[PDB]
């Protein structure tokens, strides 16, 4: 819904061929692909959040972020 | 370049930052990308196992058991 | 039984997530607007990020003798 | 090795008892059971001091470990 | 009960890297600690009910663990 | 012939450390 769906499809293309030759999408498949980057981004903007208020602020920042990664254990 | 900008605001909005500052545009991408290139590489095996040609809807699905918390 | 049709495929998704219509339908553009803040009002409250953090230590310091004697 | 070993023995009998009344626990098993938890809240621990820091604190508080865990994703 | 100790946590806790604590630090400890173990036991009693097994094994154990 | 290099006994609580990866 939210995010952009032309430069969200353009990177994807990118990628895919930036280690495997031929392949394609059967495009049912990236329909999910918005809907789970977009969730996964704000299930990651509670959580960034989180910190950049843990830290007492509320602009939030870099370090907040790289820092709750790096807990949920990615990286 | 490569996603749109004031989308990710929303975004951020969506989850309830309540002010950014400029540095986090680039850092996000950059995480975007990280997230994405796992959970692919997770999903393109789930097409090698069933031989499949271009990639299905289905296996994404599975290949998304994972950071599910 | 139920209903309806899909759309089950983007809304097992969401689950997954936690991801809701929580506001979805009242996003006028604060985001665009003052979302962000400057290098100023950044290295600010990357000030009082400082002074702050270091008494906490303390009136658990100074409240770090009543509970040993 | 890092906690004498007579609690939890103590303590987890306590909750074994609290889940299948009549589950007895055998010699070695709960063993394991320590060497667990210690990896885990070591691996906390550490992970606790980063809240602190990240507030640029030191003597942690359950401010950093209530958090550390809705992160993880244990709430609570 | 929970009647385990400060000077277990305090090793703990450098061991850990931590440089300093504060008091509150310990009995939250004992309080998370408890979630660990009811949560993990919990799931390690299962494939012990579920192997039908009488006194609990160890290798059930890291099944628990292998989980999170 | 050799090796097939390795000792330990109950060293089933190296494998435990390493799930939890420490030292």
């Given at each position: 819904?939210?995010?952009?769906?032309?430069?969200?499809?353009?990177?994807?293309?990118?990628?895919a061929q930036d280690f495997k030759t031929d392949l394609r999408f059967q495009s049912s498949a990236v329909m999910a692909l918005q809907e789970?980057?977009?969730?996964?981004?704000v299930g990651l903007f509670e959580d960034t959040n989180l910190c950049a208020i843990h830290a007492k602020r509320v602009?939030?920042?870099?370090?907040?972020?790289?820092?709750?990664?790096?807990?949920?254990?990615?990286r | 370049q490569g996603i749109t900008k004031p989308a990710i605001r929303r975004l951020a909005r969506r989850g309830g930052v309540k002010r950014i500052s400029?540095?986090?545009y680039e850092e996000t991408r950059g995480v975007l990308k990280v997230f994405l290139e796992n959970?692919?590489?997770?999903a393109v095996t789930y097409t090698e196992h069933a031989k499949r040609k271009t990639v299905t809807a289905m296996d994404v699905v599975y290949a998304l058991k994972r950071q599910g918390r | 039984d139920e209903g309806e049709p899909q759309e089950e495929m983007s809304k097992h998704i969401r689950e997954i997530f936690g991801y809701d219509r929580?506001?979805?339908?009242?996003?006028?553009?604060?985001?665009?607007?003052y979302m962000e803040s400057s290098w100023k009002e950044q290295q600010k409250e990357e000030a009082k990020s400082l002074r702050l953090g270091m008494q906490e230590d303390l009136e658990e310091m100074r409240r770090e003798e009543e509970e040993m004697q």
């Amino acid at each position: 819904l939210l995010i952009r769906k032309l430069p969200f499809q353009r990177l994807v293309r990118e990628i895919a061929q930036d280690f495997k030759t031929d392949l394609r999408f059967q495009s049912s498949a990236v329909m999910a692909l918005q809907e789970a980057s977009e969730a996964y981004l704000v299930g990651l903007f509670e959580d960034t959040n989180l910190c950049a208020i843990h830290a007492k602020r509320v602009t939030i920042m870099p370090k907040d972020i790289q820092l709750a990664r790096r807990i949920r254990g990615e990286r | 370049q490569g996603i749109t900008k004031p989308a990710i605001r929303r975004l951020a909005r969506r989850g309830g930052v309540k002010r950014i500052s400029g540095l986090i545009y680039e850092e996000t991408r950059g995480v975007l990308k990280v997230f994405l290139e796992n959970v692919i590489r997770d999903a393109v095996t789930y097409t090698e196992h069933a031989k499949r040609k271009t990639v299905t809807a289905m296996d994404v699905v599975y290949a998304l058991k994972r950071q599910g918390r | 039984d139920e209903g309806e049709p899909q759309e089950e495929m983007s809304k097992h998704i969401r689950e997954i997530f936690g991801y809701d219509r929580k506001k979805y339908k009242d996003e006028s553009d604060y985001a665009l607007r003052y979302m962000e803040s400057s290098w100023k009002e950044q290295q600010k409250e990357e000030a009082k990020s400082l002074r702050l953090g270091m008494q906490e230590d303390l009136e658990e310091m100074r409240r770090e003798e009543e509970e040993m004697q």
